[model samples]
Target: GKITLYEDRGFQGRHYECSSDHPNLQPYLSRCNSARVDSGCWMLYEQPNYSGLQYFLRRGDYADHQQWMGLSDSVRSCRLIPHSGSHRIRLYEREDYRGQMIEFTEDCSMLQDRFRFNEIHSLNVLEGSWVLYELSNYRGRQYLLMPGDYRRYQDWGATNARVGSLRRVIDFS
Candidate 1:
């Protein structure tokens, strides 16, 4: 994956090119106002170490922060997500992958419509990467999920288990 971050909008001012996940971009670019994704998908964070609000971006050019649905031009960290050919995940109503379990291989606009549950305590990523949204319609907090077992909500960097929707990390843009 390849990406370029600009300190000013319209691809102006200082810029930093990245090809791998970066935990702290403060040393490279003071502030991110625009970006250009040349390859794989990426997840941008508002703070360092992958903390704070997030935005997902794919191959494209973002002249301004709003172009990527960013709340501000404060991107401090980023992740280069691995490509996936298939997507599969299991959601559990209780911790440790117990209780009302449901599996999905596609995007869920409103999990409640299918799972009939408001929260998920544990989850397992059996195939590709996914993004878990805090509210329905893919809004609110975003949690990036790679292929692995998440024993609990915190395992995915979520403060609560109130997930309302999920989508595969596939490029459709």
Candidate 2:
């Protein structure tokens, strides 16, 4: 039995490159605010014997793009976990800026018994900061991370931290 968990498509927004002198770009370029550029991301997962998942990313909006397979460990691990009746799913992304970094997680519970996840969620990366977007987390589930700092995230990797001791889970039903 195949179940469709999530499906999303269509152009979400346009990625424009504002010139340095552009009015909107000036503030961001001048350190008053942050500059933002649009990027594409795709996550696909299938639960087979081993549970396989692939994450795809591209520089900008484009159809033909090179895929970065196995970029995130948490996404790969989610595929292996059983989803027989109900299960939890968590996603995290880590980025390094010189020696500073940050990790973000999203967990959702009571997912479909047999399901597949394929969708693109919005994300933003500031010029001088790291941002992580959580895909999904079960409602009311307590998902926590420790040593909430960019340096620690760079030192310990976001994936490892998510699977490490700082993770907290609260089961519901």
TM-score for all models, in order of appearance? 0.92, 0.16
Compared with the true structure, the alpha-carbon lDDT of candidate 2 equals: 0.23
Residue 129 shift from truth in candidate 1, angstroms: 0.5
Model 2 worst lDDT run, 10 consecutive residues? 1-10
Give the 10-residue window scoring lowest on summed lDDT in candidate 1.
164-173
Q: For candidate 2, lDDT tens digit of each residue in 1-110?
A: 11111111122232223221122322222211111213221222222221333222222332211222222222211111111222222223333233222222322232
Please report how far candidate 1 places residue 111 from its true position, in Å.
1.0
Global fold similarity of model 1 (TM-score): 0.92
CA displacement after TM-score superposition, residue 94 of candidate 1 (Å): 1.2
Candidate 2 residue pairs in clash (backbone atoms < 3 Å): 107-136, 107-137, 107-138, 108-137, 108-138, 109-138
Q: Please report, in order, the local distance difference test score of every candidate based on alpha carbons.
A: 0.93, 0.23
Off by over 4 Å in 1: none
